[PDB]
Enzyme design. Structure first.
Site, PDB file in Angstrom:
ATOM      1  N   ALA B  12      40.141  43.319  46.124  1.00 32.55           N
ATOM      2  CA  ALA B  12      40.848  43.274  47.380  1.00 32.55           C
ATOM      3  C   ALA B  12      41.034  44.710  47.877  1.00 32.55           C
ATOM      4  CB  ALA B  12      42.193  42.585  47.229  1.00 32.55           C
ATOM      5  N   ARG B  38      29.847  42.273  35.237  1.00 31.93           N
ATOM      6  CA  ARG B  38      29.514  41.032  35.961  1.00 31.93           C
ATOM      7  C   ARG B  38      29.261  41.179  37.483  1.00 31.93           C
ATOM      8  NH1 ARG B  38      32.236  36.487  35.086  1.00 31.93           N
ATOM      9  NH2 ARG B  38      32.366  36.807  32.815  1.00 31.93           N
ATOM     10  N   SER B  39      29.509  42.367  38.049  1.00 25.24           N
ATOM     11  CA  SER B  39      29.107  42.690  39.433  1.00 25.24           C
ATOM     12  C   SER B  39      27.892  43.631  39.518  1.00 25.24           C
ATOM     13  CB  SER B  39      30.280  43.312  40.192  1.00 25.24           C
ATOM     14  OG  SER B  39      31.298  42.357  40.438  1.00 25.24           O
ATOM     15  N   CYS B 127      52.487  50.084  46.185  1.00 24.36           N
ATOM     16  CA  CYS B 127      52.480  49.771  47.622  1.00 24.36           C
ATOM     17  C   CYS B 127      53.907  49.699  48.215  1.00 24.36           C
ATOM     18  CB  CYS B 127      51.735  48.464  47.894  1.00 24.36           C
ATOM     19  SG  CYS B 127      51.977  47.176  46.633  1.00 24.36           S
ATOM     20  N   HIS B 251      53.436  43.898  53.336  1.00 24.97           N
ATOM     21  CA  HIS B 251      54.748  43.800  52.717  1.00 24.97           C
ATOM     22  C   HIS B 251      55.832  44.082  53.727  1.00 24.97           C
ATOM     23  CE1 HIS B 251      52.709  43.521  48.956  1.00 24.97           C
ATOM     24  NE2 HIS B 251      52.798  44.773  48.561  1.00 24.97           N
TER      25      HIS B 251
HETATM   26  N1  LIG Z   1      31.844  39.097  38.737  1.00 28.35           N
HETATM   27  C1  LIG Z   1      32.757  38.126  38.661  1.00 28.35           C
HETATM   28  O1  LIG Z   1      32.439  36.951  38.626  1.00 28.35           O
HETATM   29  C2  LIG Z   1      34.215  38.482  38.609  1.00 28.35           C
HETATM   30  C3  LIG Z   1      35.041  37.921  37.643  1.00 28.35           C
HETATM   31  C4  LIG Z   1      36.381  38.277  37.629  1.00 28.35           C
HETATM   32  C5  LIG Z   1      36.863  39.178  38.575  1.00 28.35           C
HETATM   33  N2  LIG Z   1      36.053  39.713  39.515  1.00 28.35           N
HETATM   34  C6  LIG Z   1      36.610  40.661  40.502  1.00 28.35           C
HETATM   35  O2  LIG Z   1      38.009  40.445  40.657  1.00 28.35           O
HETATM   36  C7  LIG Z   1      38.238  39.578  41.778  1.00 28.35           C
HETATM   37  C8  LIG Z   1      38.966  38.330  41.311  1.00 28.35           C
HETATM   38  O3  LIG Z   1      40.366  38.512  41.505  1.00 28.35           O
HETATM   39  P1  LIG Z   1      41.194  39.783  40.966  1.00 28.35           P
HETATM   40  O4  LIG Z   1      42.541  39.554  41.571  1.00 28.35           O
HETATM   41  O5  LIG Z   1      41.022  39.917  39.463  1.00 28.35           O
HETATM   42  O6  LIG Z   1      40.491  41.084  41.610  1.00 28.35           O
HETATM   43  P2  LIG Z   1      41.212  42.361  42.263  1.00 28.35           P
HETATM   44  O7  LIG Z   1      42.442  42.747  41.481  1.00 28.35           O
HETATM   45  O8  LIG Z   1      41.254  42.151  43.753  1.00 28.35           O
HETATM   46  O9  LIG Z   1      40.109  43.501  41.971  1.00 28.35           O
HETATM   47  C9  LIG Z   1      39.749  43.844  40.642  1.00 28.35           C
HETATM   48  C10 LIG Z   1      38.746  44.988  40.717  1.00 28.35           C
HETATM   49  O10 LIG Z   1      38.684  45.651  39.452  1.00 28.35           O
HETATM   50  C11 LIG Z   1      37.321  45.636  39.016  1.00 28.35           C
HETATM   51  N3  LIG Z   1      37.162  45.570  37.552  1.00 28.35           N
HETATM   52  C12 LIG Z   1      37.603  44.591  36.731  1.00 28.35           C
HETATM   53  N4  LIG Z   1      37.252  44.870  35.448  1.00 28.35           N
HETATM   54  C13 LIG Z   1      36.569  46.029  35.449  1.00 28.35           C
HETATM   55  C14 LIG Z   1      35.899  46.880  34.440  1.00 28.35           C
HETATM   56  N5  LIG Z   1      35.913  46.529  33.125  1.00 28.35           N
HETATM   57  N6  LIG Z   1      35.295  48.013  34.878  1.00 28.35           N
HETATM   58  C15 LIG Z   1      35.282  48.371  36.178  1.00 28.35           C
HETATM   59  N7  LIG Z   1      35.862  47.638  37.150  1.00 28.35           N
HETATM   60  C16 LIG Z   1      36.507  46.485  36.848  1.00 28.35           C
HETATM   61  C17 LIG Z   1      36.725  44.391  39.641  1.00 28.35           C
HETATM   62  O11 LIG Z   1      35.295  44.406  39.637  1.00 28.35           O
HETATM   63  P3  LIG Z   1      34.378  43.184  39.094  1.00 28.35           P
HETATM   64  O12 LIG Z   1      33.889  42.486  40.345  1.00 28.35           O
HETATM   65  O13 LIG Z   1      33.262  43.898  38.395  1.00 28.35           O
HETATM   66  O14 LIG Z   1      35.251  42.347  38.203  1.00 28.35           O
HETATM   67  C18 LIG Z   1      37.350  44.469  41.013  1.00 28.35           C
HETATM   68  O15 LIG Z   1      36.629  45.390  41.834  1.00 28.35           O
HETATM   69  C19 LIG Z   1      36.896  39.291  42.414  1.00 28.35           C
HETATM   70  O16 LIG Z   1      36.979  39.259  43.843  1.00 28.35           O
HETATM   71  C20 LIG Z   1      36.072  40.447  41.905  1.00 28.35           C
HETATM   72  O17 LIG Z   1      36.296  41.615  42.694  1.00 28.35           O
HETATM   73  C21 LIG Z   1      34.746  39.375  39.535  1.00 28.35           C
END
Ligand SMILES: NC(=O)c1ccc[n+]([C@@H]2O[C@H](COP(=O)([O-])OP(=O)(O)OC[C@H]3O[C@@H](n4cnc5c(N)ncnc54)[C@H](OP(=O)(O)O)[C@@H]3O)[C@@H](O)[C@H]2O)c1
Ligand SMILES: NC(=O)c1ccc[n+]([C@@H]2O[C@H](COP(=O)([O-])OP(=O)(O)OC[C@H]3O[C@@H](n4cnc5c(N)ncnc54)[C@H](OP(=O)(O)O)[C@@H]3O)[C@@H](O)[C@H]2O)c1
Ligand SMILES: O=C(O)C/C=C/c1cccc(C(=O)O)c1C(=O)O
Ligand code: NA
Ligand code: NA
Lengths: 359, 357
Positions: B12, B38-39, B127, B251
């Site tokens: 986000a 996973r991205s 924030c 907020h």
């Molecule tokens: N690829 C997937 O299926 C997957 C799974 C879980 C979460 N996510 C991320 O998280 C969101 C889901 O909700 P949220 O509330 O958890 O996200 P969020 O708090 O809005 O954002 C989390 C951010 O941290 C990054 N991140 C997480 N683990 C990481 C690592 N080991 N190294 C570097 N960066 C990392 C995520 O990238 P990542 O996209 O690489 O996780 C994402 O950019 C998704 O929109 C996506 O951004 C993606």
């Protein structure tokens, strides 16, 4: 048994008045539903019986023992004194008579004693005020109250059926139709009588009622004045910020107080738990605290997040939640009626003390 | 020009970081997007350009001049010190380094001076804290601040993309399927890491982050400790109640202060109006006040409902609103990166002060 009239039977509060009376111990021989010209003639249930809604008039109250008014300030102002003249005891939900020295402003757990000297009208405080009084009276009794600061988190049903429908419509437009919140068309909130209307969907509106000339709203000033009257102590300093949020039912309040004496938190938790009408929901180790969604449908007032201020020795913070249509309105009213019955106070008042507005 | 990395580009905050960088004056020669395994390999736009997302690793930061981290505490803890070792200046949105005395905790309108002595990591505050600092600093400058009591009305985007989606799903179930809110299933709010989860639809959850030993949540305590460090005054009394409400973005805060000297309200209004980053929206005769839905998308912090306490001589109440992903996160960060550029502070740090993990 009694003849009971519900004035404003068809609105948001009225529907809960009906439910609270259906669930009441009051001996009711006859029910009458009163409303405006708009609803006059329609039908509505009491239990299994069909009741025909009547337009409210100067002469509708003959043979009525108890009338519960929830139809707006103007309607209470106009017809409640004619009910008193006809022999009724009135329990009034509106703001109109609250600050009248001839009118008890009652929360039965706190100041039921004020009911004895009634003159035919008993006023319900504001919903926000009622739940706060239930939370704080036990504290005040044991450790005193110096000041209160409160920020509220108020449900839209506080603004009536129209505001519930408007809220639901707005949320549906955004969630199902992809409308931007700022593009929404509002007709009622923040206040139906004020000049400009704003969307509540995904918003928080720091206005409830209209502005007074001190730049606080009437809702904020009601919390201030009603507290002082209910606790019979003009010395208690009270300032409020009253905010509408996207919740249909149950108000929440972040309440700060400073006691007169230091109140140990574990004793505060106990005193609140032991107070009638108040339920302690406070176990942070299991993330237990009051929530609007769990309060809905309950007559109780829920209190938690109880903790001392980080700096002020006598300071205490807490979170208070109650259903604004039940303890905040219809349950408080029925509970007053029940208390009147208990104390043999349901009988005509000989001396009229309230201005007759229709000549 | 600079090589700029966004760590957590897919989330986000990351999405707004990209937006704020797209709209920034920073001379950017190369943009890199870093996220989890996973991205990695996915493509994500920077303007019209296709950027391939890379996995964040200990050696991903060679050649980077600036890295903006918004990937979670654990990610900053592991990789930020390696970024610094590679000669990066890190701007971190997470809580991890905020209370490190080697780490400036900066709102550029308030304590830009703290940037000069950085050791390669600058921390963006919470924030909820940032918007409060923007609103209160101009008052503190003229009349002092003795205490603050704040109750927040916080948007769900603060808990991440997953929380936004959960909230939207919940609302749709109640409104479209007639589920009672108290029967909803939840998996993220109030806090992803905590044991039990509760619905936010038509609710107000008095819990943000996890509980600390003193029965205030970490969110509430961050507001207390971060305020003191930012304003460089441990004597400011600060107590908070942080509440999640069903708003996706922006907020709102009901703020009560007591100043050291009495502050005429019209002068308070004027000071805030004149303070960079703060916009006065305060005309109750026309029902003008800050609104979450109006703040969304703006870098500004909006202040209104300004009024004396009814009883406390030096007491003032106000209502403060800002977009939690912009001034609350991505814009504060980009704005730090811009201030770092302005002040000639984007350069490697000689002294390593952060333990490699
Ligand atoms: N690829 C997937 O299926 C997957 C799974 C879980 C979460 N996510 C991320 O998280 C969101 C889901 O909700 P949220 O509330 O958890 O996200 P969020 O708090 O809005 O954002 C989390 C951010 O941290 C990054 N991140 C997480 N683990 C990481 C690592 N080991 N190294 C570097 N960066 C990392 C995520 O990238 P990542 O996209 O690489 O996780 C994402 O950019 C998704 O929109 C996506 O951004 C993606
Ligand atoms: N204790 C509290 O804190 C609390 C909480 C909520 C409300 N209230 C009070 O209760 C009032 C009604 O609240 P609500 O939320 O139920 O409003 P609502 O849903 O708008 O319903 C209004 C009710 O008043 C009736 N009414 C309107 N004008 C009338 C007239 N000239 N004569 C007779 N009846 C009339 C309506 O009947 P029709 O269907 O014929 O229009 C309807 O039954 C509020 O204005 C407020 O004063 C108090
Ligand atoms: O908005 C709320 O949360 C409670 C609303 C109370 C209300 C709404 C319209 C008129 C009145 C009124 O009677 O003036 C009142 C009240 O104070 O009970
Ligand atoms: Na009790
Ligand atoms: Na009796």
């Amino acid at each position: 048994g009694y003849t009971v009239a519900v004035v404003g039977a068809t609105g948001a509060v009225g529907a809960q008045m009906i439910k609270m009376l259906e669930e009441s111990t009051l001996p009711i021989d006859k029910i009458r539903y009163l409303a405006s010209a708009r609803s006059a003639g329609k039908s509505l249930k009491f239990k299994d019986q069909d009741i025909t809604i009547e337009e409210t008039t100067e002469t509708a109250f003959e043979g009525v023992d108890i009338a519960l008014f929830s139809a707006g300030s103007s309607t209470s102002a106009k017809y409640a004194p004619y009910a008193v003249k006809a022999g009724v005891v009135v329990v009034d939900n509106t703001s109109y008579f609250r600050q009248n020295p001839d009118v008890p402003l009652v929360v039965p757990e706190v100041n039921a004693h004020a009911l004895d000297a009634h003159n035919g009208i008993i006023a319900c405080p504001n919903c926000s005020t009622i739940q706060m009084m239930v939370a704080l009276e036990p504290v005040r009794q044991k450790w005193g109250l110096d000041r209160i600061i409160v920020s509220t988190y108020q449900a839209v049903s506080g603004a009536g059926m129209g505001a519930i429908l408007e809220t639901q419509r707005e949320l549906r437009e955004v969630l199902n139709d992809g409308v931007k919140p700022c593009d929404l068309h509002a007709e009622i909130l923040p206040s139906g009588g004020d000049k400009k209307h704003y969307p509540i969907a995904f918003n928080a509106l720091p206005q409830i009622d209209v502005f007074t000339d001190n730049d606080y709203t009437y809702e904020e000033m009601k919390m201030t004045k009603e507290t002082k009257k209910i606790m019979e102590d003009d010395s208690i300093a009270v300032s409020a910020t009253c905010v509408r949020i996207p919740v249909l039912s149950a108000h929440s309040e972040s309440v700060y107080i400073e006691t007169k004496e230091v109140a140990p938190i574990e004793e505060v938790k106990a005193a609140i738990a032991a107070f009638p009408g108040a339920v302690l929901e406070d176990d942070v180790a299991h993330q237990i605290y009051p929530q609007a969604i769990n309060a809905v449908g309950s007559r109780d007032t829920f209190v938690g997040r109880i903790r001392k201020d980080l700096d002020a020795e006598k300071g205490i913070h807490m979170w208070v939640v109650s259903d604004n249509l039940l303890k905040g309105a219809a349950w408080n009213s029925v509970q007053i009626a029940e208390t009147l019955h208990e104390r043999g106070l349901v009988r005509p008042t000989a001396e009229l003390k309230f201005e007759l507005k229709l000549e």
